[PDB]
Design a protein around this nucleic acid. Structure first.
Lengths: 107, 93, 78, 96, 93, 107, 96, 78
DNA sequence: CTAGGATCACAATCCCGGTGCCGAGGCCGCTCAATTGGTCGTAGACAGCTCTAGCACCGCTTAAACGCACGTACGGATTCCGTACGTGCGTTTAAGCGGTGCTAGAGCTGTCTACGACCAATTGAGCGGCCTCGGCACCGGGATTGTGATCCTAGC
DNA sequence: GCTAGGATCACAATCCCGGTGCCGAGGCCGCTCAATTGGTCGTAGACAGCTCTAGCACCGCTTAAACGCACGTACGGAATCCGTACGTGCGTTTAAGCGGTGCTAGAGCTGTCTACGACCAATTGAGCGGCCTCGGCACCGGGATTGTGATCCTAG
């Protein structure tokens, strides 16, 4: 037979298409799953992960740090209106809060 | 007992976007939770969409529509672009 | 044990919330609110534990309980 | 000798706690509270360390959010001090 | 084209509890929506409970637990009583 | 063969045990459905339906009406703290609101 | 010759509208607004009558709830008149 | 067409909410809020329509949109 | 001339008997999905074992909590003003209702093909276990910034 | 000579740097199990065609509601004063935290079995859409009642 080529590599993705497919079949969502659905889902997940990681790494570099910690994730998420909206009812563990003091309280 | 995760793939992506930046285990747990949550949301909405239209198969269209319904504003546009590109490349092997 | 949540702790929590001045009656109210919240979460977590026929509440049970109340928690396995 | 005017130390504390991320309630009292509360639902209940840690983490986040909304409520009434009426209003509006 | 509804069964229980009381069409639509909603909530919770415990079958235990999780206070107690009585009566035909 | 006896009649219920079962099997909830699950679900639904109709009929009679309308259903739901909690997010079409005037506004 | 003091007719109107259940927004204006808004998403869009009625039911319910919360906010500030700052506060606390 | 939501209508809505006095600036704020809400709902309803390959928005599309936005509506088929 | 009261005039309201309509609620046939009796296999129940991780206890060491005290500043009560909003009337407008006409498109049916489920044979992607060393947390001690007040001056 | 604005100062807290050392991030290893390949085949949905419904467009008429304006009053907002009670700080107390030790319960896994649900065929009756009709409701006029705003009266 032919040398095994992963479905991820065929789509140029880093996320596991085969694993996404298996999780769909065994997650009791529908009777059948199209061939393109796992590819699409994996690509979307990858894009979102890339975006968040990019913003967290940027926040880390501004802090002169070389490792991402929950704080940098909180900063990245809460400083982007769109990401904040997506993750509105989400609590990042060990994230803390954004520095915000009401103007009326200042001396 | 093995416990499947997204660790390898999220690390690969990080190394692609930030070659000289690492990640703590705690942050890794955060990322895993994030991926699982967003996978659930999109798949669940696609399933509900399929049921509403009396269809039994989840195709790329259901995923696309779910992505538009979930992701706010410009997030959806780019995600759709990424998904379409991936599907196109895959179909041409 | 509810008195273990001391006045300084509540003050610290308020400080993280951006509070500058605190009335003396805020402490009893906060304790009550916290108790109610905790009761709700623990109730659901214990229900999950009992359904699994387990005698130990796991972190997953707590995560699920919080999730179903619309307070999804990241960092503890989902 | 030197005495800081009321408000200075409050703002310093605000800055310090808004910059840090550690949990602010003492672990042991919180654990004892959790165990006391769970006792009313089922007896001889054991608790994973991570379960208690998650509960504490979540509770503190909830309370911080509530104090934030309470603070916003106070400012609306041209006051700088939070009182029970502010918490009650915040909770009512939130639907709790 | 037949569109299935719970209208008949709602009318039957209404004749049991209020023999001389009728019901408008609007109220009948409301009741159908209510029943469908509660169904979706309970069934979905049971599905999640099954998945969490690495089980396939949704049994009466999953339904009972879902009811306890969703119905507040005394509504759970009586609903559980009713369900248990019905199941017990049924298994003995 | 023997005369057909409905599962609803076996359970002493008015709700359709066979239809509740069919809806569960075709609703993509699980690969398998126990025999008792539809019975239990039907009984619970029936109980809730009985409760809300009893309270709505009571509200109608208090209003000298013999037919239940959406108004009566709103009254029943919002005047019961448990039912209100269960249906907290629900909007009842043509239901209106509960008469409530703040004491501070009174003359 | 007879003039009701400010407030009496307001309270009578409150009682009347809180007792009735019909829709309070004019149908045609609302329909026109709906169609105008939908135009930005797709052209030549048709609408079922029930779709418009559902939209109107949801919008009215939402607005009534918002006015209720706004009223609660106003009273907190020892006022009886609602202003935009009250709506903004209510919405902020609600998460909108 | 947003001006079609006249001041008397907004007054009536406020009266149902138990509101006694109205500032002159409330009307514009309310109009804006309503516009935002309607935009959100119609965006979801149209998305649902597009998925079904329909050209007419049905009541079901609106009901579903409301449900997914946590504003479940009873009385229109679900 | 007082405040509180009793009395009055009026509009808005709740109430009753009469009208009549269109919906609710029952009866028709029938069809399709709910029921009955059967075989088959695998998912879950039950018993046993392991070892992990939870519980319980003990001894120091501080860090933080508790308590008390002095004081300032912030909450709150009181007063006055003016303007913005409520109430009411006359005019205008466009919403609501009815009736007609039309056609686009929703909804349904029939055909057929693609493409998704399933299997057997294959194997390398991903897993847990092990090792390491450098990014980080902590420490000491300087430089830096900011708060609080003390003393000085130019101008009133 | 008194005052506002400023310069100057004390000193407390924070930011910064260089050194220390540790234990978590990250890579390597063996291997297994679940992802890939090639093939079979059944049915779900795409596509075409057809029908008939209901959504759109238009018109006329009535009248209820919106609008604009006039007037007045009561309410928001600004200002002033009081006082108490929360904040900042020093001293004493206490118990949280950490490290260590020991026991054991129960969570997780494995093996075996059986009973339970899936699936099928045969069949029959529940409940569906269509049809009919008569009484509960919405509406009306005339009335009795209530509440609001104003007035005259009383002992004081």
């Amino acid at each position: 037979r032919a040398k095994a080529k992963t479905r991820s590599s065929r789509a140029g993705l880093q996320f596991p298409v085969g694993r996404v497919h298996r999780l769909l079949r065994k997650g009791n969502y529908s009777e059948r799953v199209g061939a393109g659905a796992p590819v699409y889902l994996a690509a979307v997940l990858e894009y979102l992960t890339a975006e968040i990681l990019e913003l967290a790494g940027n926040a880390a570099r501004d802090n002169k740090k070389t490792r991402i910690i929950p704080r940098h994730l909180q900063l990245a998420i809460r400083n982007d209106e769109e990401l904040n909206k997506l993750l509105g009812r989400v609590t990042i563990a060990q994230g803390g809060v954004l520095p915000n003091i009401q103007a009326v309280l200042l001396p | 007992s093995r416990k499947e995760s997204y660790s390898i793939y999220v690390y690969k992506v990080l190394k692609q976007v930030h070659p000289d930046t690492g990640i703590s285990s705690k942050a890794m747990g955060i990322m895993n939770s994030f991926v699982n949550d967003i996978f659930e949301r999109i798949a669940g909405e696609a399933s509900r969409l399929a049921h509403y239209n009396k269809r039994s198969t989840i195709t790329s269209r259901e995923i696309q529509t779910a992505v538009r319904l979930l992701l706010p504003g410009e997030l959806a546009k780019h995600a759709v672009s990424e998904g379409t590109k991936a599907v196109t490349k895959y179909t041409s092997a | 044990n509810i008195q273990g949540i001391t006045k300084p702790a509540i003050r610290r929590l308020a400080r993280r919330g951006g509070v500058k001045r605190i009335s003396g009656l805020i402490y009893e109210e906060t304790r009550g609110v916290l108790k109610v919240f905790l009761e709700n979460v623990i109730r659901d977590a214990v229900t999950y534990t009992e359904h699994a026929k387990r005698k130990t509440v796991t972190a997953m049970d707590v995560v699920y309980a919080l999730k179903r109340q619309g307070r999804t928690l990241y960092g503890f396995g989902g | 000798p030197h005495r800081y005017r009321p408000g200075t130390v409050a703002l310093r504390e605000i800055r310090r706690y808004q910059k840090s991320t550690e949990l602010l309630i003492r672990k042991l009292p919180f654990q004892r509270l959790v165990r006391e509360i769970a006792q009313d639902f089922k007896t001889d209940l054991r608790f994973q360390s991570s379960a208690v840690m998650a509960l504490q983490e979540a509770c503190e986040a909830y309370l911080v959010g509530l104090f934030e909304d309470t603070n916003l409520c106070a400012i609306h009434a041209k006051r700088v001090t939070i009182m029970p009426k502010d918490i009650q209003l915040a909770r009512r509006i939130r639907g709790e």
